[PDB]
Design a protein around this ligand. Sequence first.
Ligand SMILES: Cc1cc2nc3c(=O)[nH]c(=O)nc-3n(C[C@H](O)[C@H](O)[C@H](O)COP(=O)(O)O)c2cc1C
Ligand SMILES: Cc1cc2nc3c(=O)[nH]c(=O)nc-3n(C[C@H](O)[C@H](O)[C@H](O)COP(=O)(O)O)c2cc1C
Ligand code: NA
Lengths: 152, 152
Amino acid sequence: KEMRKGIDLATTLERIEKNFVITDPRLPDNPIIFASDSFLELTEYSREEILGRNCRFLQGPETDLTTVKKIRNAIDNQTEVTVQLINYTKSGKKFWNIFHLQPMRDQKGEVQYFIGVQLDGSVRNVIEETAVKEGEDLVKKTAVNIDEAVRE
Amino acid sequence: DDKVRQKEMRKGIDLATTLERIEKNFVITDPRLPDNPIIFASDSFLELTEYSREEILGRNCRFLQGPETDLTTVKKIRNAIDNQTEVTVQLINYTKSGKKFWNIFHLQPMRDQKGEVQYFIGVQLDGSKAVKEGEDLVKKTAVNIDEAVREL
Ligand SMILES: Cc1cc2nc3c(=O)[nH]c(=O)nc-3n(C[C@H](O)[C@H](O)[C@H](O)COP(=O)(O)O)c2cc1C
Ligand SMILES: Cc1cc2nc3c(=O)[nH]c(=O)nc-3n(C[C@H](O)[C@H](O)[C@H](O)COP(=O)(O)O)c2cc1C
Ligand code: NA
């Protein structure tokens, strides 16, 4: 049943039909050790391309550099954060990335992984702005379910 | 204690990535459970068969068979499974919508160090669209998967 849990985890991770990745900060430049299918479709990249690399490639010319700063802080201060950022596909098509980052720790408090979940959403009206903040909760829910899965 | 589970959950993530990088049609089943149900199915297998993971996880792979599936060839699979030995046969199977195809299938048991069978690996290949040439590739894919699962 030891290696069975490995097959199950793989499968439970593949069933999470949502945009996410997992990085290992221990490894050089905190690279991507797993990317979901949805994330691949959304960004138009293959695994061969993105595995072993840091996720900064999604950024581009009009990506707000100041929002990227907060992600450095969160990572270097090994803590979560949620932002909305301008990202690009492999070709170069823009999309608003309602992105959430958060760490995953062992019992010794050492950060083992960072779970990163992305959401897309095309004026900032009452229904439009409350929809954005509901999305930010959904990206969390997801991030937690990924955490719950990996642990259990 | 923690560390027994850290390497356990780390290798479930790596397995998920290595397995999915094979980019071939395959499933893994657990003979200890009733009906030797599917505990993993690759992305290409779904593309091929048209079913989704929820539609096939836990079920037996017999659902791929239909009207013109040669029961003698299916009998050879039974004997291979009962006698826990590999086999490579050519068989008519059907997608979810009902489309036929020649399934150049390869079964092989994933055995432990003591010799007993732990899982079964199944590799499919559409060969109707190079006869025994595909038999080698299907067997290669089996080993890829075998090694992937046992890696640790
Ligand atoms: C798990 C994880 C997921 C990330 N996902 C994204 C992302 O989807 N889009 C993005 O622009 N940056 C993402 N980042 C941020 C960058 O990969 C990078 O780590 C961050 O910008 C660090 O700043 P630097 O690039 O200036 O070193 C992610 C980081 C982590 C740890
Ligand atoms: C891992 C694995 C993969 C299998 N893949 C297929 C397949 O792709 N196509 C198929 O027609 N049968 C496949 N089978 C065979 C059926 O699951 C089943 O063993 C067959 O129907 C014979 O048993 P029965 O006497 O219950 O019908 C596979 C079996 C295993 C264990
Ligand atoms: Na997948």
